[PDB]
Amino acid sequence: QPAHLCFRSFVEALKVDNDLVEINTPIDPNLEAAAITRRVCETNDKAPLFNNLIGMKNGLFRILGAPGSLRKSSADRYGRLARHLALPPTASMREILDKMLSASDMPPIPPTIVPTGPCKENSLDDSEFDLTELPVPLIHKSDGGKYIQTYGMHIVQSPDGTWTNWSIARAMVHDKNHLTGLVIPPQHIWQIHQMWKKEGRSDVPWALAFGVPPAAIMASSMPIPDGVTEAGYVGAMTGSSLELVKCDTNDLYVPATSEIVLEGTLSISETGPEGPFGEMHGYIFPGDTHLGAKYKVNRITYRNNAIMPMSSCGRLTDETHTMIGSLAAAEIRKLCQQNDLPITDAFAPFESQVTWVALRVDTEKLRAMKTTSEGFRKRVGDVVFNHKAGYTIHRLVLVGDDIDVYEGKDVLWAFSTRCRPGMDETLFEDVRGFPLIPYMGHGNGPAHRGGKVVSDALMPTEYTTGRNWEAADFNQSYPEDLKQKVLDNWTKMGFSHHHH
Amino acid sequence: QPAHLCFRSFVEALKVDNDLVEINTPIDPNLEAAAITRRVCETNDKAPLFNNLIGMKNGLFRILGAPGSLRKSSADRYGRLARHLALPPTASMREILDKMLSASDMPPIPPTIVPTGPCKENSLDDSEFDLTELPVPLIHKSDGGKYIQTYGMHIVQSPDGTWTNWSIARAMVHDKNHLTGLVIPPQHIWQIHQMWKKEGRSDVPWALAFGVPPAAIMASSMPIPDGVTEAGYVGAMTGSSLELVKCDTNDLYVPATSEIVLEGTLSISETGPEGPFGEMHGYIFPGDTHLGAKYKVNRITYRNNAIMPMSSCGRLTDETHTMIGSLAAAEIRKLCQQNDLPITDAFAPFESQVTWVALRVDTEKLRAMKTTSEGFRKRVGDVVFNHKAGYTIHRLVLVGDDIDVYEGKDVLWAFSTRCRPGMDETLFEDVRGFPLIPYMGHGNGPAHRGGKVVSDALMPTEYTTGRNWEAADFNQSYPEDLKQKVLDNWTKMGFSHHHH
Numbered sequence A, B: 001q002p003a004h005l006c007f008r009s010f011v012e013a014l015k016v017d018n019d020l021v022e023i024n025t026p027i028d029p030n031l032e033a034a035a036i037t038r039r040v041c042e043t044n045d046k047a048p049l050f051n052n053l054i055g056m057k058n059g060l061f062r063i064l065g066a067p068g069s070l071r072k073s074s075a076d077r078y079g080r081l082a083r084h085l086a087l088p089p090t091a092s093m094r095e096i097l098d099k100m101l102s103a104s105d106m107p108p109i110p111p112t113i114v115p116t117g118p119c120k121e122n123s124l125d126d127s128e129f130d131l132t133e134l135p136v137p138l139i140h141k142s143d144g145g146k147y148i149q150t151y152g153m154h155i156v157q158s159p160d161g162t163w164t165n166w167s168i169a170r171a172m173v174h175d176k177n178h179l180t181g182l183v184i185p186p187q188h189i190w191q192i193h194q195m196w197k198k199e200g201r202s203d204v205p206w207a208l209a210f211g212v213p214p215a216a217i218m219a220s221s222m223p224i225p226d227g228v229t230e231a232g233y234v235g236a237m238t239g240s241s242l243e244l245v246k247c248d249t250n251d252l253y254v255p256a257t258s259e260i261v262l263e264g265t266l267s268i269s270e271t272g273p274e275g276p277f278g279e280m281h282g283y284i285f286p287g288d289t290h291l292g293a294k295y296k297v298n299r300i301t302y303r304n305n306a307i308m309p310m311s312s313c314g315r316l317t318d319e320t321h322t323m324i325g326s327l328a329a330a331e332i333r334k335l336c337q338q339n340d341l342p343i344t345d346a347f348a349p350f351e352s353q354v355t356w357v358a359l360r361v362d363t364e365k366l367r368a369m370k371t372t373s374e375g376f377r378k379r380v381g382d383v384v385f386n387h388k389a390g391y392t393i394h395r396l397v398l399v400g401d402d403i404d405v406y407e408g409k410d411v412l413w414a415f416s417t418r419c420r421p422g423m424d425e426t427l428f429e430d431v432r433g434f435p436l437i438p439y440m441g442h443g444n445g446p447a448h449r450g451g452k453v454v455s456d457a458l459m460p461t462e463y464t465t466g467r468n469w470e471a472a473d474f475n476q477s478y479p480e481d482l483k484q485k486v487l488d489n490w491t492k493m494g495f496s497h498h499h500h
């Protein structure tokens, strides 16, 4: 199976890429696995594969950390993400995001049902497992539970059967047969849960699949539209129908090569303590436990020598930055274009802790609109901040065509030099806010409302006659022939490789 | 003479440091010298010494580029600045700024007059020089003149004799015997010029000394208080009285080892075209010429084999960032402390294009104040933005004790995650603005007023009971013994030097 279609092949691909460290000596899931992974993520090192986890029994489980994190070299910086998608390891972020958007104007390719797969190699009924006895990691020292679920895909379906959603949402072990987790608006798992709650008749049939096809976990992390079944989107993106097998205890379908599958129900009535957790913005608030959604696990199925992927999330750079931020940015780019806004590119700068998105404007198109900053900012902010794709983003930075939004240094330069504080900004207090940002949920104002801004880093003539400056940099301040002479004589004179 | 007291020795020091490239083949002052220097600055390479400048005659002049720019390695990143001050090349920014502040609670050490020095080795009267015939550089292709003055010190004295100011302000060649330059409020050259204009009797006696003692050019770049003679401040800082020689045509005194000295007058009546110039924020606006101050040159004196220092300023990183920003930050730190504000550290992040200053708060002291964000931000902003030391700075970011303000990644993290847009900010529209920032002078609002903000990145409990989080990072999320184990086993397991 190809790497983008099968997690076990993905792990092989990482090895072949010299992008994997296999650790075959005993490693403690209580903090040690996650500490090693955290250090990987902070240093852009090779992904760790923990083959000898303390408390592993009867094949459950090994751990792969840092599945979607960054590589050290510039040339293949996003190579791990490229390996989720069948792209060359040198693929640019623009190419990755374009691949993730590609299915948005294609017919879905629905999944294909097959009778069995590797995920059925082993099973444990409700008399044979205990979640508290598995080597579930403690990821951060102050976490309020052992977070089994940091890189699996929740599967829930609308009551009418017409929408099956795949998404990542965190979850931790509650007891031998239950998890607690975040199920919050406006997320699709929450939207579907609300449909079942209004019906009021049963708990939500649910499955959680770990080590799914990489292309599927990327879609699971992206805010594709309401009502769109991720499996068909992933089929269109990859050009192939995904192979799924029915759960044993319910009628949901899981990827045939899933490493580990939990089957059960998401309660429409019960809650339990959840959190705190060391989160994407870089913080944990010890002791902040709150009631979360409660999942009952009825069955576990798993591959021989099952591997559990894990995100040791926090400060830069991990899957919560590379995937949450970038994929939200991609969806925002498309949303803007569909609303006739002249946006060419979008990215969530890592320097912003993926709380900003920089929007590159086609300023020729802008000029033809014959508008102003005040009007344009309001239009952009209304479109984005009133939509689910904008949920996680609190600052939009508008930049002109000279700025590469995928380069945080350039975004910061434009923001700092082209956007006059106050005057060139519009605040949005009557929009949904993202409570997980510390200044929201632990801040001075309402956790769930407001705190958003559009910052216009377009210069005045960009709306009228065109750019009226040149950068005071080597590229723009010197003629072509001079530049080339300097470069050609550089090492000759005495001054100081792409791949590396 | 020591390196910090003599520019010629400073150049030797750079050579000895392996921090100098001598270019002995012909180099064009029309763009080529500055292009090479620009590339140095963008790459943190060795400083260029142009010993064979096209149009050099009778000893005027060689050029040293990038005198105050950054080195590549982390360990000696600020080494060139350290060499201005007799500090070890590994000195931290905190140590550099502390050295620059040290004289603020010392008695001045006034200068010593000596009968001659190297600066008198050669002279040219007003029948023997023509400024248009010297190898003055064109620094950026769109500049409105040849900017002779990018790293010399203007010397002007109050009419009553009691204050002699040394400062850097740009100037370009107007004609054979005149310069034009920026003389703008609230700068001390402007304040003194206004005193002479009100007196109305004569033009201002003036000298411009290039290649001055390095410790003097650092003070020239710092907003030490009104009425304080820089020479005595530099004497106290260095522990030695500076040796000065009288000008030939007026009664001002210049450093004895100055490389090149221009003597003449700054007009109280005349102006001429000045600019545009590629400036510290990274831009040039071609064609934006405006009337500037006009200087008449009556005499040139210079060392044998004189060297002119040059700043090829623009995008990161050069003297306008390392010196303007950092030295302003230093003065702001002191100003805050003198106003009983609990600020421990200040720095202008390079990522902000030195338009922000991050202020580290002693939060124990803050807690004892029993205040709020709104009140505290207003107090801080009133103190700083109403003072000349705050002139160039448009955003203040307040951060707690966990943040190293000298590390831009950490400042950006705190700003993005702890300061709620709008609610946690106070805008200042009735303060002096810095027109050189593009969003000011080329923006949507008044060039000279407003556009400033205090952004509070202190979390709520920092004002009350204390920090209530831990970072989700390797350092804070894992116990000491674990961390050390991971580090000790790092290379053993398969994962990847201070000086580099």
Ligand SMILES: Cc1cc2c3c(c1C)C(C)(C)CC=[N+]3c1c([nH]c(=O)[nH]c1=O)N2C[C@H](O)[C@H](O)[C@H](O)COP(=O)(O)O
Binding pocket: A149, A150, A151, A165, A166, A167, A168, A169, A170, A171, A182, A184, A186, A187, A188, A189, A220, A221, A222, A223, A224, A311, A313, A319, A320, A323, A324
């Ligand atoms: C990549 C990724 C995405 C997480 C995520 C993590 C990762 C690694 C964690 C597990 C390490 C930490 C928490 N995360 C949550 C999360 N969304 C959410 O609602 N709750 C979460 O707990 N997301 C974001 C969520 O996957 C995206 O917002 C999707 O758009 C949700 O899919 P949907 O659009 O179908 O609702």
Ligand SMILES: Cc1cc2c3c(c1C)C(C)(C)CC=[N+]3c1c([nH]c(=O)[nH]c1=O)N2C[C@H](O)[C@H](O)[C@H](O)COP(=O)(O)O
Binding pocket: B149, B150, B151, B165, B166, B167, B168, B169, B170, B171, B182, B184, B186, B187, B188, B189, B220, B221, B222, B223, B224, B311, B313, B319, B320, B323, B324
């Ligand atoms: C380091 C440095 C400082 C420049 C400077 C440059 C450099 C290299 C240039 C030459 C490359 C470009 C322009 N600069 C000007 C400038 N201040 C000013 O009023 N006009 C200027 O043209 N400054 C800042 C000025 O030196 C500081 O604000 C001082 O505090 C002024 O001294 P004062 O406090 O005694 O007025």
Ligand SMILES: C/C(=C\c1ccccc1)C(=O)O
Binding pocket: A169, A170, A182, A187, A277, A278, A279, A280, A320, A324, A392, A436
């Ligand atoms: C960041 C996070 C949850 C989240 C992320 C994006 C959207 C919604 C919730 C968490 O579980 O720590």
Ligand SMILES: C/C(=C\c1ccccc1)C(=O)O
Binding pocket: B169, B170, B182, B187, B277, B278, B279, B280, B320, B324, B392, B436
């Ligand atoms: C930046 C700049 C002038 C300046 C700098 C700091 C304070 C005042 C003016 C210039 O000459 O380009």
Ligand SMILES: [K+]
Binding pocket: A166, A167, A168, A219, A220, A221, A222, A223, A224, A230
């Ligand atoms: K999804």
Ligand SMILES: [K+]
Binding pocket: A418, A419, A420, A424, A456, A457, A458, A459, A460, B439
């Ligand atoms: K703007």
Ligand SMILES: [K+]
Binding pocket: B166, B167, B168, B219, B220, B221, B222, B223, B224, B230
């Ligand atoms: K000064």
Ligand SMILES: [K+]
Binding pocket: A439, B418, B419, B420, B424, B456, B457, B458, B459, B460
């Ligand atoms: K705050």
Ligand SMILES: [Mn+2]
Binding pocket: A165, A166, A167, A188, A223, A224, A225, A228, A230
């Ligand atoms: Mn969905």
Ligand SMILES: [Mn+2]
Binding pocket: B165, B166, B167, B188, B223, B224, B225, B228, B230
């Ligand atoms: Mn002064």
